[PDB]
RNA sequence: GGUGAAAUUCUUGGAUUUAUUGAAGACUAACAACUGCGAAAGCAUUCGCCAAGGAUGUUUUCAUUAAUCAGGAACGAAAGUUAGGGGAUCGAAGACGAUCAGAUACCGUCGUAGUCUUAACCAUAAACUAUGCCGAUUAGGGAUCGGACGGCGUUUAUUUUUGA
């Protein structure tokens, strides 16, 4: 039986695609099959910003950000709880989850 | 739908179909007479000419070929004959 | 002993923090990179060698840098954090942020934070094989 | 040692593998601007008073 | 860890006698070329002059990283850093001139985004002064205010037209200039704004910049030229 | 250094770390997508030269010149084979350190053929859409790539026609 209509790959209209290296176990997987996450964060955590802020010599200062793109094989994706198993009917839903914008 | 008169389509509905998919095929091209400002002659030019057309007198260009219908020189006028 | 200067002015240094996932390095040089002023690693402070990367060890190693560099006359630092780089994780280790605070709290001045991790445009083959570490 | 005194203003859940440990947010009660996160072992109420030996460790989450 | 050393000093060795090597160091000041606003940029350290080891030989091949914000006293130029190479040493003073340019790492990563087109080109050029130096360029596609379509992509034929236009502009601007003249054009970003006007017809192409400049060859030292810009 | 924790290994004959410079070979990050091309295998840095191809447009030209094919022929990833060049990185075989009742393995430090290229062989893959090729008809919808046609505006240039 086919578990997924797209074979869980997202590759139709071509024959080959170069692989990539997993960011955790350094495995080789096709680029279209890997799970990709883009992350934007600050250099320092929010509790430490005040100590840096008042120790500067430039009056008001803005700590820079850091930009990373991590990408995993499926075996490392669901062991680190990046994604998890869904139900049979809930599998066919590709909308990104609604991030909480009120936080109680 | 389920009851249609296929013999008498509206003229508006036939202006949108492909040139070959109508009830009877018919071209949508035409010939035209171009008035060169420099001279007083008249030349018959196809609407979809693939070659640069030169007028008989004073030897001036009148149109430039392209992918579809040739574009005329800016300082020129034409009538559909 | 130290640079002669008026009381208003302050002299600058640069700190190069190398924080991997196995150890952390605190290194202070002059304005250029040629001359090293002080350098202490996280392994000098801890005695169990599984805590060389612990955030606690970075704080202790960072504190005596400020003490040791205080009498040299340098009063301000530039900061350049870097990860392993190359084929590595490119994510700074746990001790990267612990050391930075200890310089600020100790009384030293801070300016111009930056990240200088080296990234390849197209790298050679990476260690592990095609199947990865299967544990 | 320059020991500091802190006071608890709100409690934020109970951590630990077996629920022994509790996590609280304290206030330094001398510089009202500053506020950090700490970990405590015993039962804690609001307006409780704690003594802190070092004030640079903080805690996860 | 204290109790891991096994070989220690090695096959056979003995402890040292004299320590604290910082008692013999000296401090020097660093100056800046003519176009920049502020001249003092910091201090440097070196061993004291002695027999068999002159101090000036060690202060002739050093370079320094100074942010453009400090030199111009302006926080707008907070993402560009340039290098200064020491040439001559007066009494307790080091003289420097231009040695390159480069963006900061964080500014460049913020520019690149998905569903856009990245265009980049490079070309070598030489000035009237026989300096061989290379320039890099970068640009991105620009969205339209009333656009509804999700992605803004240019056709690869259009990309080559823009790439050809970049090379032509760079050569023309640097054709008749000196190294001092060229630097005076980098800090007001004349090249970027001139490129944008020319490529307007092909495609909008927001965010034109000169990514970095590095030099490859140098002529004779010509000490007379260095003193012209310094000591004003 | 490396690991869940350790050891083998390198070190005041200055290890690890810091800045400048040089040589060699391999590879083209981010942009990169339910997007493009090719008979399939496959193909991603710039520029110059050489021949080839699909779609669209057309009041050009020939007039059945067509479909599928037993035998037959061209191309055909990776590994492997024969002679030269090259040999940075990874790493079959091999040698050690741990774990374990045992461990010829999973983990760690080294490391030969190979990995790259020129001239010739080999003809097999879950070579997969597990779905042969030509032709006709059958239901609604919104996205997207290439060409043409129509239109109200904005933007913009030695600016119009074009491009967005
Ligand atoms: Zn993995
Ligand atoms: Zn005429």
Measured from Cα to the C1' atom, the residue closest to F1 is C22
Q: Which residues contact E5 (CB under 8 A, 6 or more apart)?
A: none
Contact B55, B49 (CB under 8 A): no
CB proximity D57 to C under 8 Å? yes
> Cα–Cα distance between E215 and E83 in angstroms, integer?
11
Q: How far is CA A36 from CA A3, C96, C119, E188, in A?
A: 22, 25, 19, 39
Q: Which residues contact C124 (CB under 8 A, 6 or more apart)?
A: C87
Give the tokens for residue E161. 């037209």
Q: What dihedral do alpha carbons C14, C19, C24, C25 form, nearest 10°?
A: -30
In chain A, residues with a C-beta closer than 8 Å to the C-beta of E75 are 58
Q: How far is CA A99 from CA A40, A85, A92, C103, E84, in A?
A: 15, 19, 20, 37, 48
Question: HSE-up of B30 (CA within 13 Å, CB side)?
Answer: 8
- Protein-covered nucleotides of chain F (CB closer than 7 Å) are 1-7, 10-14, 16-20, 25-38, 40-44, 46-47, 56-59, 88-92, 106-108, 129-130, 140, 143-149, 153, 156-164
Q: Are strands E63-67 and E43-47 parallel, antiparallel or unpaired?
A: unpaired
Burial degree of A87 (CB within 10 A; 0-12, 13-18, 19+): exposed
Q: How many angstroms away from the CA of C98 is the closest CA of chain A?
A: 10
C22 annotated ligand-binding residue: yes
Among A39, A46, A51, A68, the strongest candidate for a mutation testing the C interface, having the largest count of C CBs within 10 A, is A51
| Nearest partner of A43 among C4, C97, E64, judged by Cα | C97
Q: Is the CB of B44 under 7 A from strand F?
A: no
What three-state secondary structure class fits C25?
Answer: strand
Contact A87, A79 (CB under 8 A): no
Place of tokens 């005076």: E184
- Final resolution, Å: 3.1
Q: How many CB atoms lie within 10 A of CB D37?
A: 15
Residue C31: DSSP 8-state: S
> Cα–Cα distance between A54 and C104 in angstroms, integer?
9
Record: contact E109-A67, CB cut-off 8 A: yes
> Cα–Cα distance between C91 and C88 in angstroms, integer?
8
3-state secondary structure C94-119: CHHHHHHHHHHHHCCEEEEEEECCCC
What three-state secondary structure class fits C16?
Answer: strand
| Nearest partner of E199 among E149, E144, E159, judged by Cα | E159
> Cα–Cα distance between C8 and B20 in angstroms, integer?
89
Give the tokens for residue D43. 């039962």
C71 annotated ligand-binding residue: no
Nearest residue on chain C to A49, judged by CA atoms?
C101
Give the tokens for residue B46. 């196809």
Residue C129 CA distance to nucleotide F94 C1' (Å): 19
Element at E157 (helix H, strand E): helix E156-173
D 10-29 residues inside an 8 A Cβ radius of A: none
Q: Is the CB of C135 under 7 A from strand F?
A: yes
Percentages (nearest 5) of helix, strand, coil residues in chain E: 30, 30, 40
What ligand has the least distance to the C-alpha of A20? Answer: 1
Contact E127, E114 (CB under 8 A): no
What three-state secondary structure class fits A28?
Answer: strand
CA torsion sign for C66, C72, C77, C80 is negative
Record: contact D57-C56, CB cut-off 8 A: yes
Give the tokens for residue E75. 């926080």
A73 annotated ligand-binding residue: yes
| Nearest partner of E64 among E106, E103, E98, judged by Cα | E98
Experimental approach = cryo-EM
What three-state secondary structure class fits C19?
Answer: strand
């Amino acid at each position: 039986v086919k578990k997924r209509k797209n074979n869980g790959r997202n590759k139709k209209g071509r024959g080959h695609v170069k692989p990539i290296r997993c960011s955790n176990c350094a495995r080789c997987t096709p680029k279209d099959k890997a799970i990709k996450r883009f992350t934007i964060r600050n250099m320092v955590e929010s509790a430490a910003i005040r100590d840096i802020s008042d120790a500067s010599v430039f009056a008001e200062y803005t700590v820079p950000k850091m930009y990373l793109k991590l990408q995993y094989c499926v075996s490392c994706a669901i062991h680190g709880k990046i994604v998890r198993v869904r139900s049979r009917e809930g599998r066919r839903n590709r909308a990104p989850p609604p991030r909480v914008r009120y936080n109680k | 739908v389920l009851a249609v008169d296929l013999l008498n389509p509206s003229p508006a509905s036939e202006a949108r179909k492909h040139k070959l998919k109508t009830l009877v095929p018919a071209p949508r091209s035409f010939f035209m007479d171009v008035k060169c400002p420099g001279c007083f002659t008249i030349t018959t030019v196809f609407s979809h000419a693939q070659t640069v057309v030169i007028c008989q007198g004073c030897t001036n260009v009148l149109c430039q070929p392209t992918g579809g219908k040739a574009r005329l020189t800016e300082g020129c006028s034409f009538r559909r004959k | 002993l130290g640079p002669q200067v008026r009381e208003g002015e302050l002299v600058f240094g640069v700190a190069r923090i190398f924080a991997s996932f196995n150890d952390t390095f605190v290194h202070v040089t002059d304005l250029s990179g040629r001359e090293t002023i002080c350098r202490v690693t996280g392994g000098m402070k801890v005695k169990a060698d599984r805590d060389e990367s612990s955030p606690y060890a970075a704080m202790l190693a960072a504190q005596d840098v400020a003490a040791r560099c205080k009498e040299l006359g340098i009063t301000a630092l530039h900061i350049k954090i870097r990860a392993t780089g190359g084929n590595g994780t490119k994510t700074p280790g746990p001790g990267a942020q612990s050391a930075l605070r200890a310089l600020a709290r100790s009384g030293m001045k801070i300016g111009r934070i930056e990240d200088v991790t080296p990234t390849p445009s197209d790298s050679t083959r990476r260690k592990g094989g095609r199947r990865g570490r299967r544990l | 040692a320059p020991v500091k005194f802190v006071k608890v203003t709100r409690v934020l859940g109970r951590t630990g593998s077996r629920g022994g440990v509790t996590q609280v947010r304290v206030e330094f009660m001398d510089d009202t601007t500053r506020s950090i996160i700490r970990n405590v072992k015993g039962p804690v109420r609001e307006n409780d008073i704690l003594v802190l030996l070092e004030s640079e460790r903080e805690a996860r989450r | 860890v204290g109790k891991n050393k096994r070989l220690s000093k090695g096959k056979k060795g003995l402890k040292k006698k004299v320590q604290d090597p910082f008692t013999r160091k000296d401090w020097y000041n660093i100056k800046a070329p003519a176009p920049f606003a502020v001249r003092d940029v910091g201090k440097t350290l070196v061993n004291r002059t002695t027999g068999l080891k002159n101090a000036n030989d060690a202060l002739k091949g050093r370079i320094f990283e100074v942010c453009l914000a400090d030199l111009q006293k302006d926080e707008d130029h907070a993402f560009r850093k340039i290098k200064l190479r020491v040439d001559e040493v007066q009494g307790k003073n080091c003289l420097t001139n231009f040695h390159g340019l480069d963006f900061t790492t964080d500014k460049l990563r913020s520019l690149v985004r998905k569903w856009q087109t990245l265009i980049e080109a490079n070309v070598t050029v030489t000035t009237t002064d026989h300096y061989l130096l290379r320039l890099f360029a970068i640009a991105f596609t620009k969205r339209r205010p009333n656009q509804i379509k999700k992605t803004t992509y240019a056709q690869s034929s259009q990309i080559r037209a823009i790439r050809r236009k970049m090379v032509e502009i760079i050569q023309r601007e640097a054709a008749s200039c000196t190294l001092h003249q060229l630097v005076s054009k980098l800090i007001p970003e004349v090249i970027g704004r001139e490129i944008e006007k020319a490529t307007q017809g092909i495609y909008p192409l927001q965010n034109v910049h000169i990514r970095k400049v590095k030099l490859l060859k140098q002529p004779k030292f010509d000490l007379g030229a260095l003193m012209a810009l310094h000591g004003e």
